[PDB]
């Protein structure tokens, strides 16, 4: 133990997270960007409709 | 029962070569399907006949 | 009332197609009316009002209770040094030696006396539940359930269609929690463990960590 | 139709003779897989693993 | 090095979420064509 | 190899893989027959 | 009259009669092989089970067809009980209910001289029947002597010992032959004839494969020497190693 | 009797003044007993009668259903479990659940499939009872009629208004008796027929007062 390191390359931890602060970083950034998108959905058209896409 | 099978299986290829060639000619002629409707049914069923006939005696060989 | 899919005669019902027709006093102008009064407790219009304050306050406590019971328990499993993370074993943190340290941090609240906690709870909860009935500095004559004003700072409840839509979301998120907070009580009496410890075990082997493994627990003996 | 076809491999590995398990001791052979590992944390650990 | 790994995950998942929530925001109507 | 009641048919079965290549060549033959209308 | 309600949804009654009656109805071949000009004119969409399937022109006019409906419907209804009569005792023979002769083809050989045929009642239990062989025949010829005669005359006994007490101590004449709706319908099923007009389509169709199944029962029992429940279980044990075309060359 | 003013009462002769106004005597089982004033509303008093009758009909099937797997144990028929409240855990048994001592019967093994079939089957027949189903739509919600009464017993309405009073009185007995089976198995721990035999053994010593000091706070 000459040096201290991660020891996490061959471990196969999911999404590369090993410290549970990374999961909150993965999720907390995601929820914030979702929250700004969900509020601003009021401007993006209201397609609550039978068929209202970019149809052909 | 080998030679019973081989004559039956040479018979299959002759019928299949008819059905590969004749059947698109039956469809793509004008009114050729209304005319040879029962004719193709003879050729199709005889194909379905022999494939079980060849299929059953494999247990006997 | 607009065409808002939740209010009026075309509203969805609690048995779907098999409901037929709701009771004659549930006409669909109050939130969460799926027309379920099959015992008829609220046939009187004065009595039917009194359950709606009784339902909505139960919702507004249970939605705090559903998040409040798991969120210290969730962070406790990721290394936050709580005294106890389990919600039904967290009340007895006042009797340990270091006191109730908030977040497990000794330089936070550091409560010692259970009498001092309860002595100041009643003197505050009396006043604000007293203010909820009437009066109080944040609004004098308002609604008993949707006061608004200083209790809606961000202005989210101004349009009469959107505000009539969010009342349906409030009670359905509420009724989800009251049903679920009832679940926390029963699966703590039965299982004896924290409510995510029940979850992480059902994800382990779902065929054998279901509730039927505890079915013979209360056999008369 | 594409979900039922997944079950044919499952039924043939659990009832109809099994499949060739090359990790069997002393050279691989045909093995009926009696106990399939169906743990979601084990199964979904492959998908969110780095490549 | 853990302080650096928690920073890359904030950076990447910021820009990855501008991508995913960017194309959802009615991009196929952001065209000069008319109907 | 093939079964012994089937072994006189080895020369026919050595043609069978090449057949689907002849379907894409047929579609150019047919379009020459309609003279690329 | 019978204001009823649909099973899953919110509307009952007939689903569609126009799939099964009239000119537009299901046929034994689709539209591309068989148009509406190739239909024999004595088969129109006015009876149940009429897919127009008649290559061999046995029927001539619908009056002749109507007496073969008597041969069709009666062959159906006796076959439908037989499929249950064959399979059900064999599985109970398989699981552990001792029928001692549940397999259908060698049932009579189990009761020849010692008699002692054993009967299992679900869910009451197992009861031995201490009747001899000649006692069963005099009952069977005695009852179906009377039963078949009652259909011959068109009338029968007025007394309701047979399983009903709805107080018709009289004979019946105005019934339909092939649909004796009077005493034989205890549980209603009789108000809307449009319901019955679809039920008879289910009746012949459930009947017709039961006639096929008994034909499937007898032949595949003769080939391999098993009851069809034993044939059903072992084909599910391993299908490729146990089918038609592996039992014909099993000796080699 | 059983209708109008002169009828049976819950205090018998000492009952002419305790009877409220709204409990007149057009309904079956109207003994005029609303001591706690619960059904003073005409819509709500209509609503409890569906609750009472359905509880009455489930209890009549609950009474006999809790008895017959123990009376047949006295006829020596082996069950694996003959006590009514211990009967549910026999699908966890090694042999599983056979409908009698016959492994050639139902032979149930998986609890979760048995429950999931129930929530589909009982989930839909309870919905037919409310709105309607294959056996009729616009009927009386409690006495629907013809497909459930094939034998024509619901004719001559003076008999039919009398058979209703037979129904709830057997029923109110059954709901009272099923409240028995719960308590006499919580307190004792044995079956009802078995604890009937305990009382018929020595009645003076085998009563509830033999278990009266059981639930004391031992702290
Ligand atoms: C808000 C409602 C409330 C509820 C449901 C509880 C419940 C509990 N407290 Mg708690 N408390 C509550 C408020 C408060 N407590 C405390 C201070 C303490 C202390 C010091 C301790 C507890 C303990 C307990 C637990 C007893 C173990 C148990 O019951 O076994 C399991 C069974 C259940 C969880 C079922 C309980 C459900 C309950 C019977 C039904 C809920 C309805 C209630 C009747 C409504 C109560 C509100 C009323 C008073 C208006 C239990 C989880 C003890 C503990 O920590 O346990 C180890 C303990 O030592 N509490 C204060 C500060 C004064 C409170 C403020 O209001
Ligand atoms: C004066 C101080 C005062 C304090 C500390 C509280 C405290 C509280 N009130 Mg109360 N109230 C107070 C004045 C008043 N309240 C009310 C009427 C109500 C109602 C109807 C409700 C509350 C609720 C609440 C709780 C949640 C607050 C919230 O929604 O935040 C969110 C907003 C910004 C962060 C909280 C315990 C809610 C509750 O009890 O749910 C559990 C609730 O439903 N209060 C009135 C009448 C207009 C008041 C008048 O001054
Ligand atoms: C998982 C193990 C399991 C097995 C191997 C069986 C198998 C059996 N069940 Mg049982 N069951 C099982 C669990 C369960 N059953 C049932 C509900 C029933 C019912 C309602 C009935 C049975 C019947 C039967 C018996 C077939 C009688 C016969 O001779 O064929 C006669 C039948 C045929 C020839 C056609 C059907 C073929 C097949 C055997 C299906 C019958 C079995 C069940 C419907 C479920 C299928 C189980 C799978 C795993 C084989 C047989 C012992 C039948 C019976 O009780 O007869 C005495 C019957 O009516 N079971 C439930 C609740 C959903 C179970 C859950 O644990
Ligand atoms: C009409 C349908 C019918 C069919 C398909 C069979 C089937 C058979 N019976 Mg028969 N039986 C039938 C009517 C009846 N049998 C019997 C009583 C018997 C006996 C006692 C025996 C047969 C036997 C036979 C077999 C004679 C070969 C054959 C498998 C023999 C047998 O099963 O040997 C293997 C045999 O011993 N049957 C009675 C009661 C009078 C019948 C009613 O009509
Ligand atoms: C009252 C004496 C009497 C007895 C014992 C029978 C006996 C029988 N008849 Mg019969 N019939 C009788 C009177 C008459 N029948 C018929 C015409 C028919 C027909 C068309 C059919 C029967 C059928 C049947 C069988 C089914 C009964 C049923 O529907 O169960 C239902 C309840 C369980 C049964 C063997 C059926 C059968 O099995 O034949 C294939 C059948 O299709 N009977 C007529 C009018 C001619 C009768 C008038 O007296
Ligand atoms: C004139 C005599 C007469 C008397 C006194 C009664 C009395 C009663 N009748 Mg009535 N009846 C009478 C005549 C008649 N009744 C009826 C027909 C009916 C019916 C159909 C019903 C009644 C019912 C009742 C009961 C209504 C009140 C109640 O529920 O108390 C309940 C409260 C007590 C009895 C007091 C507490 C119980 C116990 C004595 C205390 C002992 C404590 C324990 C030892 C320990 C405590 C446990 C602790 C430790 C946890 C009551 C027992 C109802 C009933 O049966 O309720 C169950 C009912 O349904 N009667 C007819 C036929 C026309 C009568 C004919 O004259
Ligand atoms: C080791 C483990 C590591 C884990 C890492 C975590 C990985 C997580 C991966 C998740 C990947 C999912 C990505 C795709 C999401 C798609 C969302 C969407 O297309 O969304 C589309 C829909 C649109 O919803 C609709 O939006 C409508 C908007 O209406 C508005 O707008 C309309 C016109 O636009 C009208 O104007 C109308 O008046 C107006 O009200 C209405 O509100 C409808 O009621 C509503 O159904 O959104 C929705 O349903 C969304 C439903 C799902 C939401 C999920 C949220 C999850 C949050 C988790 C916890 C986060 C905590 C955050 C904390 C933040 C602070 C720190
Ligand atoms: C992708 C598959 C597909 C689809 C969607 C259709 C769709 C249709 N066909 Mg075509 N057809 C197909 C394959 C398909 N067919 C094949 C493979 C053949 C050769 C046998 C035909 C031959 C055919 C004819 C000759 C006719 C149709 C007709 C029809 C029409 C429906 C009427 C009808 O009952 O069909 C008739 C076909 C059947 C009843 C087939 C029997 C049902 C099969 C056996 C079910 C088995 C499904 C099973 C899951 C398959 C296993 C999957 C895999 C392992 C192979 C409809 C447009 C009719 C039409 O358009 O009228 C003019 C018509 O006349 N089809
Ligand atoms: C195939 C089959 C046919 C049964 C026909 C019957 C039951 C006829 C009844 C037949 C009943 C008969 C004939 C009773 C007849 C009684 C009569 C006429 C008595 C009378 C009178 C008189 C004399 C006083 C005169 C008065 O004026 C009229 C009347 C009426 O009052 C049964 C098969 C099965 O039973 C097995 C073999 C095995 C089981 O496992 C499966 C099933 C299917 C159940
Ligand atoms: C009238 C009046 C008047 C005044 O005013 C007031 C007052 C007083 C309040 C009132 C009174 C009331 C009362 C008394 C009530 C009671 C009730 C009940 C008890 C019910 C039960 C009820 C009961 C019930 C249903 C029950 C049911 C049951 C069942 C199904 C069972 C089942 C079972 C079985 C088979 C067997 C198996 O092994 C199991 C089980 C599962 C177990």
- Ligand 7 atom nearest residue A15's Cα: 1
Token pair recorded at residue H191: 């079956």
Q: At C169, is the secondary structure helix, strand, or coil?
A: helix
Query: CB contact, 8 Å: D12 with chain G?
Result: no
Give the span between the Cα atoms of D16 and D38, in whole angstroms. 20
Dihedral-angle region of residue G34 (phi above 0 means left; psi in -120 to 50 means alpha; beta otherwise) = beta
Give the CA distances from residue G97 to residues C1, C69, G91, G93, H103, in Å, rounded to whole numbers and listed in that order.
67, 55, 9, 5, 8
Give the span between the Cα atoms of H74 and H120, in whole angstroms. 35
Q: Which residues of H touch C15 (CB under 8 A)?
A: 127, 130-131
Q: What experiment produced this structure?
A: cryo-EM
Bridge partners of G121, per DSSP, are G125
Q: Is C129 annotated as a binding residue?
A: yes
Q: At G146, is the secondary structure helix, strand, or coil?
A: helix
Instruction: Give, to the nearest 10 degrees, the angle between helix G228-237 and helix G62-95.
Output: 70
Which residue from C20, G13, C76, H32 is spatially nearest to C93, judged by alpha carbons?
Answer: C76
Give the span between the Cα atoms of H151 and G165, in whole angstroms. 8
- Burial label, G5 (beta-carbon count in 10 A; 0-12, 13-18, 19+): buried
Question: Is the Cβ pair F4, B6 closer than 8 Å?
Answer: no
Nearest-ligand number for the alpha carbon of H208: 6
Question: Could you say which of H105, H137, H150 has the minimum Cβ distance to residue G186?
Answer: H150
Where are the domains positioned within chain A? 1-56
Give the span between the Cα atoms of C22 and H130, in whole angstroms. 11
Ligand 6 site, residue H173, Cβ cutoff 6 A: no
Bridge partners of H135, per DSSP, are none
- Ligand 7 atom nearest residue A43's Cα: 34
Distance from residue C124's CA to the centre of ligand 2 (Å): 12
Query: CB contact, 8 Å: B9 with chain F?
Result: yes
Contacts of G among chains (3+ CB pairs under 8 A)? B, D, H
Where are the domains positioned within chain C? 13-215
Question: Is the Cβ pair H107, G95 closer than 8 Å?
Answer: yes
Which residue from A6, A27, A10 is spatially nearest to E3, judged by alpha carbons?
Answer: A6
Give the span between the Cα atoms of D21 and B28, in whole angstroms. 52
Nearest-ligand number for the alpha carbon of C182: 1
Alpha helix segments (H runs only) across B1-61: 2-28, 32-35, 37-56
Which residue from G104, G102, G103 is spatially nearest to G118, judged by alpha carbons?
Answer: G102
Which residue from G8, G246, G227 is spatially nearest to G107, judged by alpha carbons?
Answer: G227
Token pair recorded at residue H117: 């079939």
Nearest-ligand number for the alpha carbon of B27: 8
Q: At H49, is the secondary structure helix, strand, or coil?
A: helix
Which residue from H94, H112, H111 is spatially nearest to H103, judged by alpha carbons?
Answer: H94
Q: Which residue of H has its CA nearest to G92?
A: H104
Contacts of H among chains (3+ CB pairs under 8 A)? C, G
Phi, psi dihedral angles at H97 (to 5 degrees): -120, 110
Distance from residue C46's CA to the centre of ligand 2 (Å): 24
Alpha helix segments (H runs only) across H42-110: 42-65, 68-74
Distance from residue G33's CA to the centre of ligand 8 (Å): 12
Which residue from G208, G205, G227, G230 is spatially nearest to G218, judged by alpha carbons?
Answer: G227
Give the span between the Cα atoms of A34 and A32, in whole angstroms. 5
How many beta carbons lie within 10 A of that of residue G241, not counting itself? Answer: 11
Task: Please say whether the dihedral angle defined by the alpha carbons of residues G179, G183, G189 and G191, taken in this order, is positive or negative.
Answer: positive
Q: Which residue of D has its CA nearest to G240?
A: D16
Give the span between the Cα atoms of G73 and C195, in whole angstroms. 63
Give the span between the Cα atoms of D16 and D37, in whole angstroms. 18
Q: Whose CA is nearest to atom 1 of ligand 3?
A: H109
DSSP E strand stretches across C121-161: none
Which residues in H81-106 are b (16+ Cβ under 10 Å) and which e?
ebbbbbbeebbeeeebbbebebebbe
Alpha helix segments (H runs only) across chain A: 20-39
Give the span between the Cα atoms of G92 and G126, in whole angstroms. 11
Give the CA distances from residue H90 to residues C209, D38, E10, H83, H95, in Å, rounded to whole numbers and listed in that order.
18, 27, 55, 11, 8
Distance from residue G204's CA to the centre of ligand 3 (Å): 28
Query: CB contact, 8 Å: C204 with chain D?
Result: yes
Write out the H or E segment, with its range, that includes residue H75: none
Distance from residue H29's CA to the centre of ligand 2 (Å): 50
Report resolution in angstroms: 3.4
Q: At H192, is the secondary structure helix, strand, or coil?
A: helix
CB G87 within 8 A of CB G218: no
What residues have CB less than 8 Å from C81, skipping those under 6 apart? C104
Q: Which residue of B has its CA nearest to F8?
A: B6
Residue A10 Cα, gap to closest chain C Cα (Å): 23
Q: How many interface pairs between G and H have CB atoms less than 8 angstroms apart?
A: 47
CB H35 within 8 A of CB H23: no
Instruction: Give, to the nearest 10 degrees, the angle between helix H157-186 and helix H192-201.
Output: 80
- DSSP assignment, residue H117? H
Which residue from G211, G178, G154 is spatially nearest to G66, judged by alpha carbons?
Answer: G178
Give the CA distances from residue C131 to residues C76, C138, C143, G5, in Å, rounded to whole numbers and listed in that order.
36, 9, 12, 53
Provide CATH code, domain B1-61: 1.10.287.740
Question: Is the Cβ pair C18, H130 closer than 8 Å?
Answer: yes
CB C56 within 8 A of CB C178: no
What residues have CB less than 8 Å from C39, skipping those under 6 apart? H47, H48, H51
Give the span between the Cα atoms of G165 and G17, in whole angstroms. 34
């Amino acid at each position: 133990l000459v040096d201290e390191r991660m020891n996490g390359d061959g471990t196969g931890r999911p999404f590369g997270v090993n410290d549970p602060v990374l999961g909150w970083v993965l999720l907390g950034v995601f929820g914030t960007m979702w929250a700004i998108w969900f509020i601003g959905q009021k401007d993006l058209g209201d397609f609550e409709d039978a068929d209202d896409g970019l149809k052909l | 029962m080998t030679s019973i099978l081989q004559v039956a299986l040479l018979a299959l290829i002759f019928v299949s070569f008819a059905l590969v060639v004749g059947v698109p000619v039956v469809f793509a002629t004008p009114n050729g399907w209304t005319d040879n409707k029962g004719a193709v049914f003879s050729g199709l069923s005889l194909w379905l006949l022999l494939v079980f006939v060849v299929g059953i005696l494999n247990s006997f060989v | 009332t607009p065409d808002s899919f939740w209010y009026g005669p075309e509203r969805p019902l609690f048995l779907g197609a098999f409901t037929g027709e709701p009771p004659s006093y549930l006409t669909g102008e109050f939130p969460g009316d799926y027309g379920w009064d099959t015992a008829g407790l609220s046939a009187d219009p004065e009595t039917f009002k009194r359950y709606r304050e009784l339902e909505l306050i139960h919702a507004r406590w249970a939605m705090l209770g559903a998040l409040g019971c798991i969120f210290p328990e969730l962070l406790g499993s990721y290394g936050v040094p709580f005294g106890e993370a389990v919600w039904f074993k967290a009340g007895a943190q006042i009797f340990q030696e270091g006191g109730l340290d908030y977040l497990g941090n000794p330089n936070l609240v550091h409560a010692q006396s259970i009498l001092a906690i309860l002595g100041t709870q009643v003197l505050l909860m009396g006043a604000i539940e007293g203010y909820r009935v009437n009066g109080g500095p944040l609004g004098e004559g308002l609604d008993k359930l949707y006061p608004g004003g200083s209790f809606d700072p961000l202005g989210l409840a101004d349009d009469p269609d959107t505000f009539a839509e969010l009342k349906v979301k409030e009670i359905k998120n509420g009724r989800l929690a009251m049903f679920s907070m009832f679940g926390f009580f029963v699966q703590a009496i039965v299982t004896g463990k924290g409510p995510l410890q029940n979850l992480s075990d059902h994800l382990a082997n779902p065929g054998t960590n279901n509730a039927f493994a505890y079915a013979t627990k209360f056999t008369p003996q | 139709m594409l979900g039922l076809g997944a079950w044919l491999l499952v039924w043939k590995a659990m009832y109809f003779g099994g499949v060739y398990d090359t990790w069997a001791p002393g050279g691989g052979d045909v093995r009926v897989i009696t106990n399939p590992t169906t743990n979601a944390a084990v199964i979904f650990g492959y998908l969110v693993k780095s490549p | 090095m853990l302080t650096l790994k928690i920073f890359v995950y904030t950076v990447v998942t910021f820009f990855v979420c501008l991508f995913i929530f960017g194309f959802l925001s009615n991009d196929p109507a952001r065209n000069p064509g008319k109907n | 190899k093939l079964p012994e009641a089937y072994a006189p048919f080895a020369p026919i079965v050595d043609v069978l893989p090449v057949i689907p290549v002849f379907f894409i060549l047929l579609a150019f033959v047919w379009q020459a027959a309609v003279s690329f209308r | 009259g019978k204001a009823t309600r649909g099973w899953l949804g919110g509307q009952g009654g007939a689903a569609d009669l126009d799939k099964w009656y009239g000119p537009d109805r299901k046929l034994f071949l689709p539209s591309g092989l068989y148009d509406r000009s190739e239909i024999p004119e004595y088969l129109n969409g006015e009876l149940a089970g009429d897919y127009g399937y008649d290559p061999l022109g046995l029927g001539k006019d619908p009056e002749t067809v109507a007496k073969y409906r008597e041969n069709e419907l009666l062959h159906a209804r006796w076959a439908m009980l037989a499929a249950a009569g064959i399979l059900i005792p064999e599985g109970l023979q398989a699981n552990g209910a001792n029928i001692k002769g549940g397999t259908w083809f060698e049932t009579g050989a189990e009761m020849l001289n010692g008699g002692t045929l054993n009967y299992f009642a679900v869910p009451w239990g197992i009861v031995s029947n201490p009747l001899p062989l000649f006692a069963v025949i005099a009952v069977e010829v005695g009852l179906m002597g009377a039963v078949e005669f009652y259909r011959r005359n068109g009338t029968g006994p007025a007394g309701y010992s047979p399983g009903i007490g709805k107080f018709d101590s009289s004979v019946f004449d105005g019934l339909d032959p092939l649909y004796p709706g009077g005493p034989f319908d205890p549980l209603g099923l009789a108000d809307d004839p449009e319901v019955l007009q679809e039920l008879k389509v289910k009746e012949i169709k459930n009947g017709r494969l039961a006639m096929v199944s008994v034909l499937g029962f007898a032949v595949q029992s003769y080939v391999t020497g098993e009851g069809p429940y034993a044939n059903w279980t072992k084909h599910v044990a391993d299908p490729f190693g146990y089918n038609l075309l592996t039992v014909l060359g099993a000796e080699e």
